[PDB]
Design a protein around this nucleic acid. Sequence first.
DNA 1: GGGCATGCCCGGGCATGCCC
DNA 2: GGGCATGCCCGGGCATGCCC
Lengths: 195, 195, 195, 195
Amino acid sequence: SSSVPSQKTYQGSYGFRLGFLHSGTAKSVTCTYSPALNKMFCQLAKTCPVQLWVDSTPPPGTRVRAMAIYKQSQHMTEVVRRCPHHERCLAPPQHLIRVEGNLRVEYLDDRNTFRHSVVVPYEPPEVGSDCTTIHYNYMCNSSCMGGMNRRPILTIITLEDSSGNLLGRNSFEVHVCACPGRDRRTEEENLRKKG
Amino acid sequence: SSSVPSQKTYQGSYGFRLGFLHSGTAKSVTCTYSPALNKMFCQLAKTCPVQLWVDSTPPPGTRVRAMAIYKQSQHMTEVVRRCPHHERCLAPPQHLIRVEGNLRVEYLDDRNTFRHSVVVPYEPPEVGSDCTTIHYNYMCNSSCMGGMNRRPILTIITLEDSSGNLLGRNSFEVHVCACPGRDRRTEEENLRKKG
Amino acid sequence: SSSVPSQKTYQGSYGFRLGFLHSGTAKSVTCTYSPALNKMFCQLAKTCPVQLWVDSTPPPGTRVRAMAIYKQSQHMTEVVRRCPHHERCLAPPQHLIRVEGNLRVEYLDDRNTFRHSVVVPYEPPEVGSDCTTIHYNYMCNSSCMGGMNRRPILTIITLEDSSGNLLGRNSFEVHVCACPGRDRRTEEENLRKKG
Amino acid sequence: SSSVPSQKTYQGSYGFRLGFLHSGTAKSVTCTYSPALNKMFCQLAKTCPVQLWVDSTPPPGTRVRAMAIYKQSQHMTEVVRRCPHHERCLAPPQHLIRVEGNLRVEYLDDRNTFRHSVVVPYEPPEVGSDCTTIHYNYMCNSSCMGGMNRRPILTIITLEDSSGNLLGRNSFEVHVCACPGRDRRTEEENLRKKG
DNA sequence: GGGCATGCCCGGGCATGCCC
DNA sequence: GGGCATGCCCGGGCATGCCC
Ligand SMILES: [Zn+2]
Ligand SMILES: [Zn+2]
Ligand SMILES: [Zn+2]
Ligand SMILES: [Zn+2]
């Protein structure tokens, strides 16, 4: 059995999709999302709100899981972990991705694949709104030595029922950096000029 | 009975064929496939994704075997092994080909032919995709002294049922090297100018 | 009592001084010493030869101690350590400075000051030469996150008798980096243009 | 105590010096010596005759020892060994340097420094000649992967009495290669043009 | 002996954490 | 927000085992 989780978008029978909030591109804005690149640019240990959108309401007991994988083919089979520095200085210190502001968060270390994930219960949007927001946190920069070490990652968000069935899957690239607005504008300019 | 395994393409009743991802020809790209040559150019100990495509779904318990053989007639009967340097510094150290990212990988040392092979279970593409990707690893350069020693090899991929029936066979040439982009462009140029 | 060791040059009654071998300024030469800056530029985990010169021969049992301290006033009281990444992947893993090629090397963790040092016996130059060379090793880049973190250090070399009397002291600045030739030429140019 | 043996020439009270025979510079001559570079160019596993010259006859029981060390500073503390390939395919297989045609040859693995050496008894030149020749053999190319790996070496010849006293020391650089005449002419031309 | 292929050295230059 | 320093990617090119 493969230890590499799928990243292919699966909107599923519930119409599962992600949403992200517009940001305003200061050089060091705390987070900013590029629709053209399907890529979040954000700062380490700071809030990265992700919206959950569904056409049909999931069944009770549905869970929302987040997992990071390296985007490039030569690194895909390597588990994404926190670097030794940020690990040394609740959430186990080896986990890259945290969820803030949720009382039912669980951190999994898969017994077979060794991959990390963080799971919270799915809550339908309150009577009166269109989506559900999760406050994620990335605890390393993409550049961290001994961790992501300048390798781009994807975050895989899966909607799963209590029985474990995959109900939906979406993914976005993440670049954790000191200056999200600068790096977003640079990669988007490179895309237009040399893409 | 012959100890030289067949390399002849046998697409079989299941329409078995291999696929490879386009790469972009940097001089030292980690892997790049040449369709004109049916030849993978890749770097040692780095991921080499190979796609499995089928027209019909194989029965349960189907396995996928990979095995290296020397391409040239005068070397065909010699077992392809890891060189002593890379052998010394679950995969046995003598095996050239490894599979990354699979929990059910098996390494075989044939009791009679002494040939090495690595086997994983066949998994059908997930509901929502067209092929299955295996992450292969070549643990020597083609040039390694005491190993391949600058001799070209073929990788033979066989689809086999649990009973051992050959369901399909495909093969591609491999050149493991420091600069796959350079060597691919050089051989393709030699093919055009002097082939 | 102060836990900050002295860096002031004390050539002493034995005429103790340090020497360094000229290098040739390739961009990524493994080590190169700048006399104008009294500064070694070297690569991590690679040999950095340091010459011991004396006018008078030290008594038997003399020892040679090396110790790193931060050069800048605001960091001087912080112990120089290996960063967590290089620590994790006879020399204790927390020590920045190692000595290669000596059978009588000792690594000290000071019980009171917590500072690290590495000591070898002093050997007089062999009948027929002018100095004694010690092969030092710096196990982090100056830029290492969670370690030196881009802060310049000094290496303090003390000649001590077996009783612990300070016989001599010398020091040089160290910049461990990927391209010692580039960084040396850049700092020397900044010194000339704006020093 | 240092584990790096001295390479400094010590002609000593017996006037100890090496001699080498003129060769004639075919591209692949089996061995050829460059006086300008004090450097032997030779082929692997082939005879490399070295002459021993003395002004005064050594005492009975004098021994002749040969030992290889890396010439460059960043490799000097590493023991010079045979590569895994030539080790796998009398003299222990890990030893680079052998002596041919001598019935009293000894191979030492130093218990403390781990360095290899090969020793034969010193014989004075027969009544009627000026020097004594030893037939050395280098069992790897300088290029061998996992061995010298393209790093230049020195051979240190020491004349020692039976008690262990150093009587004399000389050294020459060695380049073991397929084409000694080509590589000698190339390095000598580079010396004139860019030295 | 002439010349090719290939592992790796080499300097130019990019990206990114952080000083200013 | 502008700009510097630095680890490392990148293509040019050298050296060397071996084919011819
Ligand atoms: Zn980190
Ligand atoms: Zn190998
Ligand atoms: Zn470090
Ligand atoms: Zn060898």
